[PDB]
């Protein structure tokens, strides 16, 4: 059976092609002994007192290869419990991944794990496939990076891809900064995890930020409470929507970048004028950071304000979009016509890593 591994900056999603969900979802972290020899994922966190913990993937790109090998090793033998030499393996990569990185992923899979076949797909393209489309523009926002990726007839259009180095972890850091200013103590990575949970449980995207600020200033109607591990109950009101507003207004964390609605529009305006109607009518949201309540309605509003007045705009935000990349990979690797598209180990032995492009 083919395997599918979606390597994210924050979470690894892995499982078997043809399944409706990844069987393994675990933190993309590797720890090694600080004094006087590796752990991956939840066990690394459990033993963080004796380990130095690193994320091998930064903003969607693999940066620590030795640790990335540990992530894949753990994926195969500990999480999925498979022998990789027995399974074709589909891997994912970020948009705009350097060619050298794609070659190195290929070399490690064939030479270190001895997979019989592999393939590398762009994450956003798989999310589009998971919605049953081969044309559209995807907003994929995870833990480390956000991209707008316009895709036509199955191919991402690389010249029109936009990137924002703002995503879920930066939103958690911003919420942590706001809550620290209010007088709570959140400092360590363990404590930041409490903030991440607050963000997921209570934050939302306001349809109209100014209006929502006025509501929260004049009423307690938006307030929600949350019990911290130490027993304190914190109440938040405008913090709920000021946190993800940073996606529309990156200046909130001191970035000069345009917001996700403007990067969507600019992406579409980089594409051929003859495909723009298809993009506007097929805006698919993918990734954990697109889960906030309200985000699709806000996107619909903002893109409507930027686009020509008669343009048909549709935002597609599937309930399963935390795992839409992986589900697209599960579909693609299960299809009969895809089976001749795997790069085989035999082809790699003849031609080397450059075959992957």
């Amino acid at each position: 059976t083919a395997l599918v591994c979606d390597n994210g900056s924050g979470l690894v999603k892995a499982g078997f092609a043809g399944d409706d969900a990844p069987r393994a979802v675990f933190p993309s972290i590797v720890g090694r002994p600080r004094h006087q020899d590796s752990y991956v994922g939840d066990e690394a966190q459990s033993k963080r007192g004796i380990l130095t913990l690193k994320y091998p993937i930064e903003h969607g790109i693999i940066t620590n290869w030795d640790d990335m090998e540990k992530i894949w090793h753990h994926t195969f033998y500990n999480e999925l419990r498979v022998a990789p030499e027995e399974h074709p393996t589909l891997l994912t990569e970020a948009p705009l991944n350097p060619k050298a990185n794609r070659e190195k992923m290929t070399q490690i899979m064939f030479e270190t794990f001895n997979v019989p076949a592999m393939y590398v797909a762009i994450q956003a393209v798989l999310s589009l496939y998971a919605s049953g489309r081969t044309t559209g523009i995807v907003l994929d926002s995870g833990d480390g990076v956000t991209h707008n990726v316009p895709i036509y007839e199955g191919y991402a259009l690389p010249h029109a891809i936009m990137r924002l180095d703002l995503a879920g972890r930066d939103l958690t850091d911003y919420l942590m900064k706001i809550l620290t200013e209010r007088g709570y103590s959140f400092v360590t990575t363990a404590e930041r995890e409490i903030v991440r949970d607050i963000k997921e449980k209570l934050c939302y995207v306001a349809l109209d930020f100014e209006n929502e600020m006025a509501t929260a200033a004049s009423s307690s109607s938006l307030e929600k409470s949350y019990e911290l591990p130490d027993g304190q109950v914190i109440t938040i009101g405008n913090e709920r929507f000021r946190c993800p507003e940073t996606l529309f207004q990156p200046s909130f964390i001191g970035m000069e970048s345009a917001g996700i609605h403007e990067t969507t529009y600019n992406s579409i305006m980089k594409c051929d004028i003859d495909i723009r109607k298809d993009l506007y009518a097929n805006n698919v949201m993918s990734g954990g950071t697109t889960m906030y309540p309200g985000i699709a309605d806000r996107m619909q509003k903002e893109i409507t304000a930027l686009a020509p007045s008669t343009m048909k705009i549709k935002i597609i935000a599937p309930p399963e979009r935390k795992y839409s990349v992986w589900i697209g990979g599960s579909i693609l690797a299960s299809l009969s016509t895809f089976q001749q598209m795997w790069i085989t180990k035999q082809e790699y032995d003849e031609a080397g890593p450059s075959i992957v492009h």
Binding site: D20, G132, T134, G154, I331, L335, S336
Partner: peptide, 22 residues
Amino acid sequence: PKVAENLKSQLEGFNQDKLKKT
């Protein structure tokens, strides 16, 4: 070319209810 055409057709027509429950 023919492969790309058929693959697009299978993706566009795929019913996610076919996928196995985990």
